[PDB]
Amino acid sequence: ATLKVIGVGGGGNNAVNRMIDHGMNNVEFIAINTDGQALNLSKAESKIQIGEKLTRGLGAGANPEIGKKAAEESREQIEDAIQGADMVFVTSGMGGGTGTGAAPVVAKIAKEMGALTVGVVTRPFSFEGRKRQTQAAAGVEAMKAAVDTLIVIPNDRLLDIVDKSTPMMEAFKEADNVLRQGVQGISDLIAVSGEVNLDFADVKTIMSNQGSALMGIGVSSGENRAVEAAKKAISSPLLETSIVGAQGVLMNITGGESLSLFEAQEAADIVQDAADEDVNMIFGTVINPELQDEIVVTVIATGF
Numbered sequence: 683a684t685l686k687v688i689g690v691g692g693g694g695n696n697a698v699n700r701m702i703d704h705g706m707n708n709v710e711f712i713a714i715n716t717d718g719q720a721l722n723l724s725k726a727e728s729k730i731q732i733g734e735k736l737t738r739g740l741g742a743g744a745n746p747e748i749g750k751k752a753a754e755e756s757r758e759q760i761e762d763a764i765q766g767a768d769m770v771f772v773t774s775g776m777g778g779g780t781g782t783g784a785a786p787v788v789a790k791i792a793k794e795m796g797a798l799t800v801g802v803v804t805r806p807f808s809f810e811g812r813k814r815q816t817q818a819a820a821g822v823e824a825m826k827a828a829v830d831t832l833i834v835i836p837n838d839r840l841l842d843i844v845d846k847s848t849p850m851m852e853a854f855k856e857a858d859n860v861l862r863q864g865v866q867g868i869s870d871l872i873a874v875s876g877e878v879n880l881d882f883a884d885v886k887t888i889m890s891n892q893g894s895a896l897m898g899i900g901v902s903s904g905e906n907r908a909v910e911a912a913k914k915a916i917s918s919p920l921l922e923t924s925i926v927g928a929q930g931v932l933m934n935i936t937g938g939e940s941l942s943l944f945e946a947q948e949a950a951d952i953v954q955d956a957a958d959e960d961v962n963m964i965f966g967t968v969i970n971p972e973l974q975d976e977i978v979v980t981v982i983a984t985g986f
């Protein structure tokens with residue numbers, strides 16, 4: 683199953699560049715922008731410049747109608763770059779001109795083409811003002827009605843989880859953790875055949891046309907290693923929705939040879955309780971003898 687990560691706008695490409703510098707293998711990146719000046723500094727193995735005649739190589743100057751029309755008009759090259767993909771993550775800063783307008787349509791392209799399409803967008807800092815927060819909003823709703831399932835990140839939460847000293851690029855990286863977690867997690871299920879296996883059909887089942895989504899990976903060792911990992915796993919302070927009310931869950935548990943039944947049940951109960959609802963849970967496990975004292979819980983939860 684081939685996974686493609688698509689940045690749309692400068693935000694999206696920064697997202698991409700950081701994720702490359704982090705090193706993610708067996709995921710194919712695509713950078714997409716109106717701004718040529720940007721794309722020239724992207725590390726993406728594949729780049730697509732859109733709205734060329736609309737903007738002559740400049741960004742969309744905070745009118746999304748431009749990013750929209752731009753992409754809608756470079757559809758065919760986009761499609762060629764997409765093709766061969768089973769799942770696509772569409773990543774974008776909402777509020778700009780390019781992202782807000784083009785991103786909803788990259789994903790609508792991606793959905794019609796048949797891909798399982800996950801939106802991962804940022805809402806902007808309150809300090810960017812009301813007007814941007816509203817353009818951002820319009821984007822997010824287009825993105826919701828355009829994808830299978832959407833992840834939203836109000837940028838303001840960074841200010842809540844950062845200390846007064848943290849460089850800006852660090853805060854943005856911490857926001858990247860969401861995308862990195864989903865991508866690494868799914869990539870990992872797909873690549874490994876478990877004792878109780880999860881595969882891509884399960885991903886399709888919990889993620890197709892489900893609205894809001896949470897994606898986590900939690901890692902821990904110690905006494906309560908399984909409760910602690912499942913608790914790390916299901917908890918971003920960076921999201922718009924919590925886990926509560928979830929209606930679909932896919933959950934994988936990876937451990938060494940001492941992975942107990944009792945504690946697999948314990949992590950699964952962390953989750954099942956946490957939704958506060960009768961869930962459709964699909965459950966899987968992997969015993970990786972390399973792993974010594976630590977376990978990793980991968981959780982993907984939708985249905986809000």
Ligand SMILES: Nc1nc2c(ncn2[C@@H]2O[C@H](COP(=O)(O)OP(=O)(O)OP(O)(O)=S)[C@@H](O)[C@H]2O)c(=O)[nH]1
Binds near residue numbers: 744774779837
């Ligand atoms: N969290 C995070 N947010 C970003 C980043 N880059 C931009 N943003 C936010 O996302 C929004 C849009 O990002 P940006 O890439 O500048 O828009 P654009 O679509 O490129 O807009 P334009 O070039 O046509 S004007 C901005 O309002 C900003 O708040 C980033 O690297 N990390």
